[PDB]
Specification:
Chain A contains 15 helices and 33 strands. Chain A is an alpha+beta fold and 752 residues long. In chain A, the strands form ten sheets. In chain A, strands 10, 11, 12, 13, 14 and 15 form a six-stranded antiparallel beta sheet that branches. In chain A, strands 2-3-4-5 form a four-stranded antiparallel beta sheet, with no helix packed on it. A four-stranded antiparallel beta sheet of chain A has the order 6-7-8-9, with no helix packed on it. In chain A, strand 2 and strand 3 form a beta hairpin. The longest helix of chain B has 16 residues. In chain B, 15% of the residues are buried. With 46 residues, chain C is an alpha+beta fold. Chain C has one helix and two strands. In chain C, strands 1-2 form a two-stranded antiparallel sheet. The chains are: A alpha+beta (752), B alpha+beta (149), C alpha+beta (46). Chains in contact: A-B, A-C, B-C. Chains A and B meet through loops of A and helix 2 of B. It is classed as transcription/dna. The entry lists the keywords pre-initiation complex, Mediator, complex, TRANSCRIPTION-DNA complex.
Chain lengths: 752, 149, 46
């Protein structure tokens, strides 16, 4: 794997920590007092890293990320398991809140309690047909499961001296903390890990000493009973014998440098990396019913000592039939175990044989965490660097391009269903097959069910755009998709404000009535006849109308622009394409034009103010005439004769009758991807943008030359919007509260 | 005639949509008619001196911290060689007089030296409120010379 | 007659007929009438 990109800073050592989110946010401790600071990274925007003070007191030893993103847990070696949430929703402005404390050091992984949804990826046995059978739901249970059947949030944390801390998080917002000893014989737990056993979440807390002591697994249930947390422990089959203390090579591997359950939520498989000074040996173990007892599932030849172990995070079915077709189709991602060595190398492991799948002979990596699709790494280098290495779906094997297509399509569809993120998949998409991926996405979106297509009718556009940012043959299409997303948004927030009084007789919503009349019945070339054949009882209180002007002026300026671009003046494919030529977006715009006419007949203020050349021309009527002509030409399928000479004749006059405005376009930037290289790395700096490759896009409020007000910015969209909702107390709250979390693409906000 | 725009603009300076109001009303027309748009100061004074006053920085102390000490030793063929003068600059200098280091351990023995000291302390006391290293060293030269009388 | 010549990006240089008021098409700006047929000619050299 090549470096995606690697960025250092400008410039004793303590253990580091990193945690890659469900979305793409990395949180690494980065011990350079800025030794105790948590760094947050956007991973599609390095060079802007937020340094949370973290207010801890000893080394931040365990970091961990909520299964939903949106929450970060950091425990020190003093005991403050502190929960970091997202201050008014913004990915670069974290805030400290409810946590807990026990003065011993939380040395074992802080775990985040398991919601019921586990996952399943039937990998290539069914990487052909549909979405339900590709990505299935396994029946794992929650921890405490609820009062009423939906999991309770919380965090287990085991400390040296073998305490446990459950600390449930009540929906009320206050913690219910508890503490109880693992085993009555208190003992040293130096390296330890937590994972969750499917049956009712009887979560198992493995805990070893340092050397030649058993690894001593345990069992801890959670027991909300009596309005106070309760935890009950029972020992489990202990496992001595890392299998290196019996080969009569006695002390060649004293210490245990790592023990990590092969996957959280996948207990009954543990990885044990013994080591020494310049030596290491890793072994997996499996708890088989024989009485339960552990026995080696795989062991590795002597190795240079391991510095960091990173586990796969993508759910993959280990069934024999599935691994068979994975070996055939070479869909390697899930079957990976990233071991990082002191010499400088990085090896991937088979996860069931612990052979070597790939190497990166290339200062070692002291903290390493895989991505959520097994396509990226994050190596906090010892000197202070940070690399994002690409792990190819097939470990460098050049197998045919259709197969790479099927691999990446399967992963992207997984990311569509789970909604996690797809920046990693974007790291690998070559510029050659972006068009083909988009075509296969079109297919696999049409084919599915006509029910799930609603779930994905907003993520499909985002993935289409993020793909089309590659492949310089199709950069023209990203602007139009991010405009179609905005058009859909406006249509769904203006067809939802109607609120009539009448419901005349039948089931016909005012938006449904809008659409049915506009499309089916009155394809009249002239407005004020569409206004006639409609109920004029769309009355919003005259305050929200006035607040709606900054948006309706968009739909106005966009109709004007789209109709202006018909003569195709530009030599290249312009930035209004594909909205011409057979779009239903023409129908949507016509609906919005009719409703704007009806609105403005009530309050003239909330109309699109066009700067006209002729004084009394009724500009809206002319634009509606042009739209109707274009939509009549583009409704029925087949005719490339839409630009009938009359229509282009009318359109080429439009600069003479109005002033073609200048719009933002909302890719608003070209992200780090589509810039990296095929192979070459990209040296970066923290706080200094790569030197070379003001519109408030969600309120359409012009910030001046300089902004003078703070503003967030979508990480993937490029959008920029004002942070404090600068409109008056009277402001449409169907918009500012729609984007207050994730923006229309679906990406987090970041402060400027 | 400017009063209408004056009070109009002054009316809404606070509004957070003031920039949008300014842009909406004006930018269309304006695009319609106009188209698209060591303290290193002491280094200087030490550089520009007269050759006779060869000045180096004190081997004792660490000139690194705010004030650099100096060990300057008169030369000049006309004069009589005397004891060195150890300077200290209050890094806030200029507008800060550079201290002198008084010591009878230097001058006590002989008459020429004690006369030098008398003349030096008097003239330095006279020097006004704004001494620059050049002022100290010049005063010292005049003192040596006047003691040679 | 008062044609007006905008200079522009790398090469081009624009030629309007300055008499016609930019914000109105019916009005002739102050005193100078429009030049009939200039569009044809300046196209002839285009």
């Amino acid at each position: 794997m090549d470096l995606a990109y690697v960025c250092e800073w400008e410039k004793p050592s303590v253990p580091l920590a990193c945690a890659w989110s469900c979305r793409n946010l990395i949180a690494f401790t980065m011990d350079l007092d800025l030794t105790r600071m948590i760094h947050i990274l956007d991973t599609e925007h390095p060079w802007d890293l937020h340094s949370i003070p973290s207010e801890h007191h000893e080394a931040i030893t365990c970091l961990e990320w909520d299964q939903s993103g949106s929450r970060l847990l950091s425990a020190d070696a003093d005991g403050q398991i502190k929960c970091w949430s997202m201050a008014d929703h913004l990915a670069n402005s974290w805030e400290s809140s409810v946590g807990s404390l026990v003065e011993g050091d939380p040395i074992v992984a802080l775990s985040w309690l398991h919601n019921g949804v586990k996952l399943a990826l039937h990998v290539e046995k069914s990487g052909a047909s549909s979405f339900g059978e590709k990505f299935s739901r396994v029946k794992f249970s929650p921890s405490l499961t609820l009062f009423g059947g939906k999991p309770m949030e919380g965090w287990i944390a085991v400390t040296v001296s073998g305490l446990v801390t459950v600390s449930l998080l009540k929906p009320s917002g206050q913690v219910l903390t508890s503490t109880e000893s693992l085993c009555r014989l208190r003992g040293r737990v130096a390296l330890a890990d937590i994972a969750f056993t499917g049956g009712g979440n009887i979560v198992v807390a493995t805990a070893d000493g340092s050397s030649a002591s058993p690894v001593q697994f345990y069992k801890v249930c959670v027991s909300v009973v009596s309005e106070k947390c309760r935890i009950d422990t029972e020992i489990l089959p202990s496992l001595f014998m890392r299998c290196t203390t019996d080969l009569n090579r006695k002390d060649k591997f004293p210490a245990i440098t790592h023990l990590k359950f092969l996957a959280r939520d996948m207990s009954e498989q543990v990885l044990l990396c013994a080591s020494s000074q310049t030596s290491s040996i890793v072994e997996c173990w499996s708890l088989r019913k024989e009485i339960l007892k552990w026995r080696i599932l795989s062991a590795t030849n002597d190795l240079d000592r391991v510095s960091a172990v990173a586990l796969p995070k993508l759910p993959i079915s280990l069934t024999n039939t599935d691994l068979k077709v994975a070996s055939d189709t070479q869909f390697y991602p899930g079957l990976g175990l990233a071991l990082a060595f002191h010499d400088g190398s990085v090896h991937i492991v088979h996860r069931l044989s612990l052979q070597t799948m790939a190497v990166f002979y290339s200062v070692h990596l002291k903290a390493m965490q895989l991505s959520w699709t097994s396509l990226a790494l994050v190596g906090i280098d010892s000197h202070g660097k940070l690399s994002v290495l690409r792990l190819s779906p097939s470990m460098g094997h050049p197998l045919e391009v259709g197969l790479a297509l099927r691999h990446l399509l399967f992963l992207l569809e997984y990311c569509m269903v789970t909604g996690y993120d797809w920046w990693d998949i974007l790291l690998h998409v070559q510029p050659s097959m972006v068009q083909s991926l988009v075509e296969k996405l079109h297919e696999e979106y049409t084919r599915q069910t006509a029910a799930l297509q609603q779930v994905l009718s907003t993520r499909i556009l985002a993935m289409k755009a993020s793909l089309c940012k590659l492949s310089p043959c199709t950069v023209t299409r990203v602007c139009d998709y991010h405009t179609k997303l905005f058009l859909i948004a406006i249509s769904s927030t203006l067809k939802s404000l109607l609120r009539p009084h009448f419901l005349n007789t039948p089931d016909k919503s005012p938006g449904d009535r809008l659409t049915e009349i506009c499309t089916k019945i009155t394809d009249v070339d002239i407005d004020k006849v569409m206004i006639n054949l409609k109920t004029e009882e769309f009355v919003l209180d005259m305050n929200t109308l006035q607040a709606l002007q900054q948006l309706l002026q968009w739909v106005g300026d966009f109709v004007l622009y789209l109709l202006a671009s018909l003569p195709n003046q530009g030599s290249l494919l312009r930035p209004g394409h594909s909205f011409l030529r057979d779009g239903t977006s023409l129908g949507m715009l016509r609906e919005l034009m009719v409703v704007i006419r009806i609105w403005g007949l009530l309050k003239p203020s909330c109309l699109p103010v066009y700067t006209a050349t002729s004084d009394t021309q009724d500009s809206m009527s002319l634009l509606f005439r042009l739209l109707t002509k274009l939509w009549i030409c583009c409704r029925d399928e087949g005719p490339a004769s839409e630009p009938d000479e009359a229509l282009v004749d009318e359109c080429c006059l439009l600069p003479s009758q109005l002033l073609i405005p200048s719009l933002d376009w909302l890719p608003a930037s070209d992200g780090l991807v589509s810039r990296l290289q095929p192979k070459q790395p990209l040296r970066l700096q923290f706080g200094r943008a790569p030197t070379l490759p003001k519109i408030d896009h969600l309120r359409r409020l012009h910030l001046g030359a300089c902004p003078t007000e703070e503003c967030k910015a979508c990480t993937r969209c490029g959008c920029v919007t004002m942070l404090k909702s600068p409109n008056r107390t009277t402001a449409v709250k169907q918009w500012e509260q729609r984007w207050i979390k994730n923006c229309l693409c679906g990406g987090l906000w970041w402060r400027v | 005639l400017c009063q209408p725009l004056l009070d109009a603009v002054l009316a809404n300076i606070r509004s957070p949509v003031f920039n949008h109001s300014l842009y909406r009303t004006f930018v269309p027309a304006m695009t319609a008619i106009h188209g698209p748009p060591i303290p290193s100061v002491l280094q200087g004074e030490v550089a520009r001196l007269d050759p006779k006053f060869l000045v180096n920085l004190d081997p004792s102390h660490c000139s690194n911290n705010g004030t650099v000490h100096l060990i300057c030793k008169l030369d000049d063929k006309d004069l009589p060689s005397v004891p060195p003068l150890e300077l200290s600059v209050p890094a806030d200098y200029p507008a800060q007089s550079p201290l002198w280091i008084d010591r009878q351990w230097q001058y006590d023995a002989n008459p020429f030296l004690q006369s030098v000291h008398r003349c030096m302390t008097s003239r330095l006391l006279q020097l006004p409120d704004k001494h620059s290293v050049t002022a100290l060293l010049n005063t010292w030269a005049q003192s040596v010379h006047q003691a040679c009388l | 007659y008062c044609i007006d010549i905008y200079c522009r990006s790398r090469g081009v240089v624009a030629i309007r007929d300055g008499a016609y008021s930019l914000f109105d098409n019916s009005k002739l700006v102050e005193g100078f009438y429009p030049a009939p047929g200039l569009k044809t000619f300046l196209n002839m050299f285009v």
